[PDB]
Amino acid sequence: KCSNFFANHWKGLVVFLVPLLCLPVMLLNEGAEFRCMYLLLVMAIFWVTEALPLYVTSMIPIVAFPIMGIMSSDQTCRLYFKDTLVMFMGGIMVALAVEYCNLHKRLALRVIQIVGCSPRRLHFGLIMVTMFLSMWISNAACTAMMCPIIQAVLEELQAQGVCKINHEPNEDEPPYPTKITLCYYLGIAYASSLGGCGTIIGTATNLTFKGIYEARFKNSTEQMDFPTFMFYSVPSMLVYTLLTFVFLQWHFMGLWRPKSKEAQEVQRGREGADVAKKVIDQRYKDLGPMSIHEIQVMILFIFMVVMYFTRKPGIFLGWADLLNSKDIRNSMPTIFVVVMCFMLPANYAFLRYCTRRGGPVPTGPTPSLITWKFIQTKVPWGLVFLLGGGFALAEGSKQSGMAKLIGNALIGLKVLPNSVLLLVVILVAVFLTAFSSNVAIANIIIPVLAEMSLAIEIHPLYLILPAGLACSMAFHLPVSTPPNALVAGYANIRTKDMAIAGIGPTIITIITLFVFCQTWGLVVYPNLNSFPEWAQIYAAAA
Amino acid sequence: KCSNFFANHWKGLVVFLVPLLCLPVMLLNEGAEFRCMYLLLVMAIFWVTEALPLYVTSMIPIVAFPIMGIMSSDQTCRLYFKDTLVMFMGGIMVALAVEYCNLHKRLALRVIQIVGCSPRRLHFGLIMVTMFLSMWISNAACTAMMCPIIQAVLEELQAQGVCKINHEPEPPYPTKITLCYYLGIAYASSLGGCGTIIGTATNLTFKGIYEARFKNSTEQMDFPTFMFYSVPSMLVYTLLTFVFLQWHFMGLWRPKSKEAQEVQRGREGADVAKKVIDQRYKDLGPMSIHEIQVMILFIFMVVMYFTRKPGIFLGWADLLNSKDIRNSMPTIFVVVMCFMLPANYAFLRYCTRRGGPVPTGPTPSLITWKFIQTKVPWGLVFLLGGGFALAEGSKQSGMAKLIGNALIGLKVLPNSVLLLVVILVAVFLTAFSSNVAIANIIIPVLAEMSLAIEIHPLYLILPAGLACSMAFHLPVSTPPNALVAGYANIRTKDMAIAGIGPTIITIITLFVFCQTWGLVVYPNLNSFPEWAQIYAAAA
Ligand SMILES: CCCCCCCCCCCCCCCCCCCC(=O)O[C@H](COC(=O)CCCCCCCCCCCCCC)COP(=O)(O)OCCN
Ligand SMILES: CCCCCCCCCCCCCCCCCCCC(=O)O[C@H](COC(=O)CCCCCCCCCCCCCC)COP(=O)(O)OCCN
Ligand SMILES: O=S(=O)(O)c1cc(N=C=S)ccc1/C=C/c1ccc(N=C=S)cc1S(=O)(=O)O
């Protein structure tokens, strides 16, 4: 057993040894919750270390749950491929439809002309636009929307000679992305996650903990209206985004290190702006006027986004409330657009048969907006298992009883002083959300915090708001949040790079949430520090 | 001009014009039954005419049902990706694992070696091996695997001068021997597909529909019982098909047909040529531990399939009795084990017995994810799920009862003539379109009609479900036919003439073995069972 043996063969050692070492967890304790804990622990070690492919590791619960007796085999498979998963896959398909024509190149060339063709400036603009867009739309939709634009921008910069997308070349193993590509893709993913926290309709986590608070505490003086939540949350969101942008510049592009070879590259790229402006303008003119194919794709995309926005906005009715015979969710418009792409034609030259006294006749079947061959090749189909694993694991945790075990576990924190309690609550929320779905963590932690707040005589919002915002802060692993998985799949990003890079945003968001809550929340809700009367009534009743 | 536009642009006309033309059905009638019927009619016309891609057409229910009153968005999406579909996808992945590392080549060449080398014995060996392989793999995959071997043998035979691939002199016309070999391979693929549930998708479709419609039925189509029902008839008509082709092209029973002389030249000489080329082409190397491990995993998976719920003893799924397991943990277990296990075990030189060069990098596994992602057909998810979802919506909306009441008049006809008519109609419909589409269209209608009359549902569903897989006349009928017609430049007229034999043989064989052997496998097909009475009364 030389050291070289470990250097070469450590993945197999992990796969062989970890289950045997983790066996005592279930052997010592009787309940089924400990079986679920064992399975979760082994899956977590496989995710962090990446001994197996991620997609294969996500296939374990199908085998594991029926054997352990947690839940039946038919139910487990149905837990995959739920409504939200269909929405995600449809979004990826629509993005490929956009890429099939050259609309993404047109949009990229337009943006470069406005920005000024500087690598540092473009990155800032794309992050800000992504955050503003994600304030009103689901995060995965924004990430899928924005990925091809980033790809086109990187190709243009490479064409001008500024940078390289991939390192110069186990022939199967895909190319390793460069520092700048990592910076851009991680930037758009993090920007989606950070900008989501802005408004009440930005993401489902906000709606979840809002609903829990409203249900548990009616007759509450303080209220989470649409304007008030935004007024509370926006400044912190701005500070997150700017500080995260600065950190990303420092980590990957050598912002404050002039000697570093990273900075010299950006300096040489910026040196050539004057001629690059004419080059970009000429290359844009080289593209012809927008064809009908592009216009049709663009109209379909705008229609999809508008239908996304107007469903139960909360400030007016929307189309969901008109149709109340059955529940309708966001999967409907997406698949509608996917089908409509296959129905419509790319050209209308066949109309020359009946009009314009004839003309050049196609002499062939007319292509549609997209082809199935392009979809079957480009879509990453492993994401089905990776995303469905989260739903399956969450439902298994709920069925087994491990969630109640965790909720009982948090109760012991009552002894701590107030500020230390707030900090520990934020840390616990971040750690738990690292490995699981955001909504599940909110569901398990929030009611405990409400009850514990009533017990110890402090205002419930004081703990509820920071934790609810904290559940969204997931940056380390691809399995933490759908944007991470999407960007990892689109451009092959190894887990180690993401885990190392994610350190900055975590510290930044924790510190800034702590400070702005403790100070600015007092301004927005003046009675936060003190204990109100209606809280006393509920405490006495309970 | 006028005809040419229709010739080029008929698919767009269908797609545009069918929904508007079928709209009055929904407009004039008030019930939800008619909305479901309108959706069914449009989807059926799209599947038959191929106006829109099959996988894309299958996605319509997700949009259509929630907008109407049928079902919610969550429920419709759950209808996709059931247990059986996961079993089928895992089986495809395991078959890919077998294809990787070239085990099928070993089995095929070894069996051909064991059987004779003369042209007739070579034909017999090719047909039998193709049938056996197609029992567990997709049909087109088996055809693609098997064609190169006969191509090489034919090339060498032509080079020697013992036989000619083509007529002497707009592609060249293949001769009778080439037609015999290639058509035999395609037909063998199609016939052997029917033997097993995982052999072809149509089996999964009709089994899943039957299980969904009648959850209380006491007769079950589990993996072993289906095999018991299907295998003997498969062997009988495979043998009869082989005998038919030999008479049609090689003059088997005609002593001097001017076709037996070619075979006599083949048996006199070039037997050694074929033997040498096949023996040399079997130079894969010694059997390796990688292949052995894959083989053991496959055998273990099948053994787990048989011992789920046997009548003789308990077995698993009874020792683990808290929840249902249902033939889905073995398949995914094998798939994961393929990624866990190494392929060399040469790294054990490090510990002791250092007899050779040690590895300098990570050791590969039995398979890679890149191979899986590029080879698996992922549209089957949408196609199969769409079939299941349409069936379930038909059940819930209430349109199923309306169709059954309409077909009550067929009660006067005797049971045997009804079975024959069902088989004939299934074959005729299959002639022009996809097998899975036809199964989706016709199986639920048969189930409801069976409830209306006093007939056991299996009695009609099994023969029709198997008949949906019998397609030989045209390239459009099934992908193996198209692949074979592409390889050897087969004109349509010859294929249509040659396919007459298998049609009659399979029809007669199904007609006889159903009525006789099914009663041995299912003793209660002649009677009307109690649970059927309960279902009919409730409906
Ligand atoms: C009530 C119902 C209960 C049901 C229970 C079901 C349990 C199922 C789950 C089982 C979990 C464990 C599975 C382990 C599989 C074998 C893993 C072997 C890994 C291996 O050999 O790695 C090498 C080093 O091994 C070493 O150094 C390890 C020592 C040698 C191990 C030899 C293993 C093979 C021989 C035995 C096979 C059977 C094992 C038991 C099933 C280096 O490999 P690498 O990293 O270079 O390349 C890896 C390419 N993937
Ligand atoms: C309670 C009420 C419920 C109502 C329910 C209604 C349900 C409606 C369902 C959808 C119906 C509309 C379908 C829209 C797409 C039509 C696609 C036509 C394709 C086309 O032009 O085909 C060409 C010939 O067209 C022709 O010769 C025909 C004329 C084509 C005109 C094109 C018009 C485009 C805009 C249509 C808007 C429709 C809005 C909805 C009415 C030849 O094509 P090919 O074979 O060469 O290529 C094939 C690949 N494409
Ligand atoms: O988590 S739960 O399975 O309990 C769940 C129940 C619901 N009940 C109802 S209606 C609705 C949603 C829901 C889970 C949603 C997600 C679960 C995991 C995600 N990412 C990962 S990994 C993202 C979402 S998201 O769609 O909310 O963004």
PDB file of N, CA, C and O in Angstrom, chain B residues 359-384:
ATOM      1  N   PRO B 359      -1.032  -0.231 -12.861  1.00  0.00           N
ATOM      2  CA  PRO B 359      -1.700   0.862 -13.576  1.00  0.00           C
ATOM      3  C   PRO B 359      -1.118   2.215 -13.196  1.00  0.00           C
ATOM      4  O   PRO B 359      -0.624   2.410 -12.084  1.00  0.00           O
ATOM      5  N   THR B 360      -1.166   3.148 -14.143  1.00  0.00           N
ATOM      6  CA  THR B 360      -0.683   4.506 -13.931  1.00  0.00           C
ATOM      7  C   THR B 360      -1.802   5.531 -13.839  1.00  0.00           C
ATOM      8  O   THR B 360      -1.520   6.732 -13.805  1.00  0.00           O
ATOM      9  N   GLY B 361      -3.057   5.095 -13.808  1.00  0.00           N
ATOM     10  CA  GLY B 361      -4.175   5.999 -13.706  1.00  0.00           C
ATOM     11  C   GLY B 361      -5.405   5.317 -13.149  1.00  0.00           C
ATOM     12  O   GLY B 361      -5.389   4.129 -12.819  1.00  0.00           O
ATOM     13  N   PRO B 362      -6.498   6.065 -13.026  1.00  0.00           N
ATOM     14  CA  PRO B 362      -7.758   5.461 -12.582  1.00  0.00           C
ATOM     15  C   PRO B 362      -8.209   4.358 -13.530  1.00  0.00           C
ATOM     16  O   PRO B 362      -8.062   4.462 -14.749  1.00  0.00           O
ATOM     17  N   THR B 363      -8.764   3.301 -12.957  1.00  0.00           N
ATOM     18  CA  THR B 363      -9.228   2.158 -13.737  1.00  0.00           C
ATOM     19  C   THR B 363     -10.644   2.409 -14.243  1.00  0.00           C
ATOM     20  O   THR B 363     -11.485   2.895 -13.485  1.00  0.00           O
ATOM     21  N   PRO B 364     -10.947   2.093 -15.499  1.00  0.00           N
ATOM     22  CA  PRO B 364     -12.298   2.333 -16.015  1.00  0.00           C
ATOM     23  C   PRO B 364     -13.325   1.417 -15.370  1.00  0.00           C
ATOM     24  O   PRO B 364     -12.997   0.412 -14.739  1.00  0.00           O
ATOM     25  N   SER B 365     -14.592   1.795 -15.524  1.00  0.00           N
ATOM     26  CA  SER B 365     -15.699   0.968 -15.069  1.00  0.00           C
ATOM     27  C   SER B 365     -16.255   0.149 -16.230  1.00  0.00           C
ATOM     28  O   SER B 365     -15.739   0.174 -17.348  1.00  0.00           O
ATOM     29  N   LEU B 366     -17.338  -0.582 -15.965  1.00  0.00           N
ATOM     30  CA  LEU B 366     -17.920  -1.428 -17.000  1.00  0.00           C
ATOM     31  C   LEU B 366     -18.581  -0.602 -18.096  1.00  0.00           C
ATOM     32  O   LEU B 366     -18.769  -1.089 -19.215  1.00  0.00           O
ATOM     33  N   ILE B 367     -18.961   0.641 -17.797  1.00  0.00           N
ATOM     34  CA  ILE B 367     -19.617   1.507 -18.768  1.00  0.00           C
ATOM     35  C   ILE B 367     -19.343   2.961 -18.402  1.00  0.00           C
ATOM     36  O   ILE B 367     -18.856   3.268 -17.315  1.00  0.00           O
ATOM     37  N   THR B 368     -19.648   3.864 -19.335  1.00  0.00           N
ATOM     38  CA  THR B 368     -19.491   5.298 -19.134  1.00  0.00           C
ATOM     39  C   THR B 368     -20.828   5.996 -19.335  1.00  0.00           C
ATOM     40  O   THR B 368     -21.706   5.489 -20.033  1.00  0.00           O
ATOM     41  N   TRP B 369     -20.983   7.172 -18.722  1.00  0.00           N
ATOM     42  CA  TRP B 369     -22.233   7.903 -18.898  1.00  0.00           C
ATOM     43  C   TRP B 369     -22.332   8.530 -20.280  1.00  0.00           C
ATOM     44  O   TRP B 369     -23.439   8.739 -20.785  1.00  0.00           O
ATOM     45  N   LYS B 370     -21.199   8.839 -20.908  1.00  0.00           N
ATOM     46  CA  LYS B 370     -21.234   9.412 -22.248  1.00  0.00           C
ATOM     47  C   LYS B 370     -21.846   8.439 -23.244  1.00  0.00           C
ATOM     48  O   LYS B 370     -22.592   8.846 -24.141  1.00  0.00           O
ATOM     49  N   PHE B 371     -21.533   7.152 -23.108  1.00  0.00           N
ATOM     50  CA  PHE B 371     -22.120   6.138 -23.976  1.00  0.00           C
ATOM     51  C   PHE B 371     -23.625   6.045 -23.772  1.00  0.00           C
ATOM     52  O   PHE B 371     -24.382   5.897 -24.736  1.00  0.00           O
ATOM     53  N   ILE B 372     -24.077   6.122 -22.519  1.00  0.00           N
ATOM     54  CA  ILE B 372     -25.502   6.021 -22.221  1.00  0.00           C
ATOM     55  C   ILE B 372     -26.257   7.225 -22.758  1.00  0.00           C
ATOM     56  O   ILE B 372     -27.353   7.088 -23.311  1.00  0.00           O
ATOM     57  N   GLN B 373     -25.696   8.422 -22.602  1.00  0.00           N
ATOM     58  CA  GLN B 373     -26.445   9.627 -22.940  1.00  0.00           C
ATOM     59  C   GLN B 373     -26.690   9.715 -24.440  1.00  0.00           C
ATOM     60  O   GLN B 373     -27.709  10.256 -24.878  1.00  0.00           O
ATOM     61  N   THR B 374     -25.777   9.177 -25.244  1.00  0.00           N
ATOM     62  CA  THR B 374     -25.882   9.332 -26.688  1.00  0.00           C
ATOM     63  C   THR B 374     -26.665   8.210 -27.365  1.00  0.00           C
ATOM     64  O   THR B 374     -27.127   8.394 -28.494  1.00  0.00           O
ATOM     65  N   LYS B 375     -26.824   7.050 -26.724  1.00  0.00           N
ATOM     66  CA  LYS B 375     -27.431   5.910 -27.407  1.00  0.00           C
ATOM     67  C   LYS B 375     -28.884   5.652 -27.023  1.00  0.00           C
ATOM     68  O   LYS B 375     -29.640   5.124 -27.843  1.00  0.00           O
ATOM     69  N   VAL B 376     -29.294   5.988 -25.807  1.00  0.00           N
ATOM     70  CA  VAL B 376     -30.648   5.652 -25.347  1.00  0.00           C
ATOM     71  C   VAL B 376     -31.665   6.525 -26.073  1.00  0.00           C
ATOM     72  O   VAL B 376     -31.452   7.741 -26.198  1.00  0.00           O
ATOM     73  N   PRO B 377     -32.768   5.965 -26.578  1.00  0.00           N
ATOM     74  CA  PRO B 377     -33.839   6.789 -27.158  1.00  0.00           C
ATOM     75  C   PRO B 377     -34.689   7.413 -26.062  1.00  0.00           C
ATOM     76  O   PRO B 377     -35.458   6.720 -25.390  1.00  0.00           O
ATOM     77  N   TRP B 378     -34.575   8.727 -25.893  1.00  0.00           N
ATOM     78  CA  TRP B 378     -35.283   9.376 -24.798  1.00  0.00           C
ATOM     79  C   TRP B 378     -36.693   9.829 -25.157  1.00  0.00           C
ATOM     80  O   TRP B 378     -37.418  10.283 -24.271  1.00  0.00           O
ATOM     81  N   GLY B 379     -37.110   9.715 -26.417  1.00  0.00           N
ATOM     82  CA  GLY B 379     -38.482  10.050 -26.759  1.00  0.00           C
ATOM     83  C   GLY B 379     -39.493   8.988 -26.375  1.00  0.00           C
ATOM     84  O   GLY B 379     -40.699   9.271 -26.344  1.00  0.00           O
ATOM     85  N   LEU B 380     -39.030   7.768 -26.096  1.00  0.00           N
ATOM     86  CA  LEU B 380     -39.945   6.727 -25.648  1.00  0.00           C
ATOM     87  C   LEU B 380     -40.653   7.128 -24.368  1.00  0.00           C
ATOM     88  O   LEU B 380     -41.795   6.722 -24.143  1.00  0.00           O
ATOM     89  N   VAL B 381     -39.999   7.929 -23.527  1.00  0.00           N
ATOM     90  CA  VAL B 381     -40.655   8.430 -22.326  1.00  0.00           C
ATOM     91  C   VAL B 381     -41.962   9.113 -22.690  1.00  0.00           C
ATOM     92  O   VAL B 381     -43.038   8.734 -22.212  1.00  0.00           O
ATOM     93  N   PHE B 382     -41.895  10.102 -23.580  1.00  0.00           N
ATOM     94  CA  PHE B 382     -43.091  10.844 -23.947  1.00  0.00           C
ATOM     95  C   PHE B 382     -44.088   9.968 -24.689  1.00  0.00           C
ATOM     96  O   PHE B 382     -45.290  10.054 -24.433  1.00  0.00           O
ATOM     97  N   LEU B 383     -43.620   9.102 -25.588  1.00  0.00           N
ATOM     98  CA  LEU B 383     -44.561   8.277 -26.348  1.00  0.00           C
ATOM     99  C   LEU B 383     -45.358   7.341 -25.434  1.00  0.00           C
ATOM    100  O   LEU B 383     -46.601   7.330 -25.452  1.00  0.00           O
ATOM    101  N   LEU B 384     -44.660   6.569 -24.600  1.00  0.00           N
ATOM    102  CA  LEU B 384     -45.331   5.622 -23.718  1.00  0.00           C
ATOM    103  C   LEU B 384     -46.194   6.334 -22.683  1.00  0.00           C
ATOM    104  O   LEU B 384     -47.335   5.921 -22.421  1.00  0.00           O
TER     105      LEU B 384
END
